[PDB]
Design a protein around this ligand. Structure first.
Ligand SMILES: O=C(NO)[C@H](O)[C@H](O)CO
Ligand SMILES: O=C(NO)[C@H](O)[C@H](O)CO
Ligand SMILES: [Mg+2]
Ligand SMILES: [Mg+2]
Lengths: 434, 434
């Protein structure tokens, strides 16, 4: 069997109509996916699916970046790809000319990450396993073979990664049973989009708690008076026991961030996400030093494992977000999860975007089983949008993610959805733009 | 007058045929330009030119990214653009949806930087001044109005930037005279490409010194025995007085970098460039601490001013490279140059690529006149390749850059060159690919 085509689609959803996903930095995002399919000449079931998440404009550029990887992947043996995902990833990340466009950051790296993710989807499908089990059931040797240890020898070596993975082997099966029976903790951000009225914020916050979520997140960062008012209203709506996180989406400078949080601390903050630039490691550390013990996090825009290494080394975070589509695919997220485990820093996956809940749940679950054995101390983000467009939509029960069962990364989208929302010739857009 | 079109071209040169530009990370680069033209309905002379430098594959993606900015720029008033370059830049850098593809890093940011650079070219042309004079002759107020001070309040405020620029005003004219009469120090990397034979290295090293260059640079990083042999041969060829820098192009990890340099120090190293990942601020600092006083530099791949701020704060560098096309255009490089000046760190501009010498010379010259008043303590990189394709090619005299005189950023390329090397339908490529 061989990969006979790399198909790409520019799919965009009009989330801006109701300001779903709105925040202090992105006031009107249109959740989009640079969707990719690795087609094979095997069974219709044998294909890999993946996507890069963007928020509208630029999605065509992101799609073109993914399409440019066809030369590298078309013609490859499926058996060889799924048997050495490290080699598959390296063919792309070690292309020095593509590295120049990054290296390992921005559009070109996310495009590479989507194709790598599609390869893991293909591997899991071939193994007839949901991705989280596929990953968690690989041997420690197989797992480290997929990781790029360059630039990490000062923090995580192959031998050190092997040790962590081997330490978990005895409890892998038991943890798998626990996850299947109990699900994984989740928190929701849907009640907190910044573009919503105070009335809507309160209504949704209450519905979130009524739905079983033990934690919710509010967007902040544009106006301190608005933030004080909204945080007070939300805290009153959810009660004193529910956790409430806030997210500034990179809006502040170091000094202003510390002063801003000084005005929100009274509302019992679970953590402040992305108080400043996603590139400012020293800055996050300075902010953390100034607002401690109020927890600081960042991660959804962290470009690669090298920056994550520094965030951990510098003590710039109390917890981190990981994102399924921001980095170099599964291979890179495995390195990031191992780094987090070694440094004893909790991971709260980001999932604010179309298909992100579907994808990232697998990484968190694989981590629980094969890496940390810890989930009750953390949570996976959840947003109540666009799940209807996926064949295997995430399922939430009493505020917890149920473990996926069908084979794959849960990335496959309904062809009808692609036909309706492809930009700009999709049925919805042709009429909307008209 | 209005901008009526944003034209883009995927131009690639077969530099890999003779391995020109080859290094430890990029063994066979094909110097390329994602060329852009801001056309107006004014005089044929009234147009802005710019380009993103890449090394081959991916240049089509980079070109597509630039093309995607047409919606933002086509239709704009030329007078309004050139009168507020800060506002022009912000229209692009503050587009939250385009920020998602970065933010301020990779393909999308370099595309934005090229269009911003083309706008500065347009402004300089309208003023009938070479870019370095256009920049250096703007008032301190006009200059700070173009800068993005976000994420820099802890290191460089608007008031602090104004102070630095105002301190230089008294000597601006005198410095301009000095530069015009003496030129700016240069160093050459052309003798050191890693793919060259020992014989070629020696021959070119000698020619470089004979041509007046007081400093040369050798590529290192793939094999320590090769590096020891080559450094010994080059040092013997140039004599004990000529400066010799080495460049590893990001190949090493922290520990290995320190051990590697321990074996090259005996050859009197001017500085080691990019010993590790361009994202590892803490890593460069650790390497610097281990090999001091051997100078450490980085910068050609530094994504934006925020990372530069940290390199300076952390004391990760002894000197830095800046690059005309890696960041957000002139606006960002002005912030970087001011940060470097405030921290008292020398700047040695990178120019290893097509059109980079032509572009970056203007930033170094503007810095000398309006910011530091220091040039004899530093140098602009030079490579002896592809200058024939530019209308205003750089001119080197006795190892020094002569100050450009014609209006513009020196980015305009010969239409004949574009027709010959456009990929893949250009005259040269249609026949070469056949
Ligand atoms: O930050 C996020 N969620 O945490 C989202 O990705 C962002 O707000 C865009 O909707
Ligand atoms: O690093 C460089 N010059 O310093 C070049 O850009 C690189 O070697 C690609 O030719
Ligand atoms: Mg967030
Ligand atoms: Mg270099």
């Amino acid at each position: 069997r061989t990969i006979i085509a790399l198909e790409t689609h520019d799919v965009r959803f009009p989330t801006s109509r109701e300001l779903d996903g709105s925040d202090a930095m992105n006031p009107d995002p249109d959740y989009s996916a640079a969707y990719v399919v690795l087609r094979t000449d095997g069974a219709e079931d044998l294909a890999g699916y993946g996507l890069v998440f963007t928020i509208g404009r630029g999605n065509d550029v992101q799609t073109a970046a993914v399409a440019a990887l066809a030369e590298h992947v078309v013609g490859l043996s499926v058996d060889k790809v799924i048997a050495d995902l490290g080699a598959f990833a390296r063919r792309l990340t070690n292309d020095s000319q593509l590295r120049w466009l990054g290296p390992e950051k921005g559009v070109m790296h996310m495009a590479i990450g989507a194709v790598i993710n599609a390869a893991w989807d293909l591997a899991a499908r071939a193994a007839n396993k949901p991705l989280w089990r596929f990953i968690a059931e690989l041997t420690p040797e197989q797992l480290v073979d997929t990781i790029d240890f360059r630039y990490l020898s000062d923090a995580l070596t192959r031998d050190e990664a092997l040790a962590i993975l081997r330490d978990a082997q005895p409890q892998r099966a038991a943890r798998t049973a626990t996850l299947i029976e109990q699900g994984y903790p989740a928190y929701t951000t849907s009640p907190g989009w910044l573009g919503y009225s105070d009335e809507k914020l309160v209504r949704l916050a209450k519905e979130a708690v009524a739905d079983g979520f033990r934690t919710i997140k509010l967007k902040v960062g544009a106006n301190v008076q608005d933030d004080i008012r909204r945080c007070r209203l939300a805290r009153a709506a959810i009660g004193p026991d529910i956790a409430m996180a806030v997210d500034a989406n990179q809006r502040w400078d170091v000094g202003p961030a510390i002063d801003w949080m000084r005005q929100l601390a009274e509302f019992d903050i679970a953590w402040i996400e992305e108080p400043t630039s996603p590139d400012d490691v020293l800055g996050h550390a300075a902010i953390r030093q100034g607002i401690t013990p109020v927890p600081v996090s960042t991660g959804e825009h962290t470009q690669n494992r090298v920056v994550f290494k520094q965030l951990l080394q510098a003590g710039a975070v109390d917890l981190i977000q990981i994102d399924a589509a921001r980095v170099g695919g599964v291979n890179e997220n495995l390195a990031i999860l191992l780094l987090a485990a070694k440094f004893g820093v909790r991971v709260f996956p980001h999932a604010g975007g179309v298909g992100l809940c579907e994808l990232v749940q697998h990484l968190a679950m694989a981590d629980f089983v094969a890496i940390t054995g810890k989930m009750e101390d953390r949570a996976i983000e959840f947003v109540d949008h666009l799940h209807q467009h996926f064949l295997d939509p995430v399922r939430i029960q009493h505020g917890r993610y149920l473990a996926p069962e069908v084979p794959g990364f849960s990335a496959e989208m309904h062809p009808a959805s692609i036909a309706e929302f492809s930009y700009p010739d999709g049925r919805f857009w042709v009429e909307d733009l008209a």
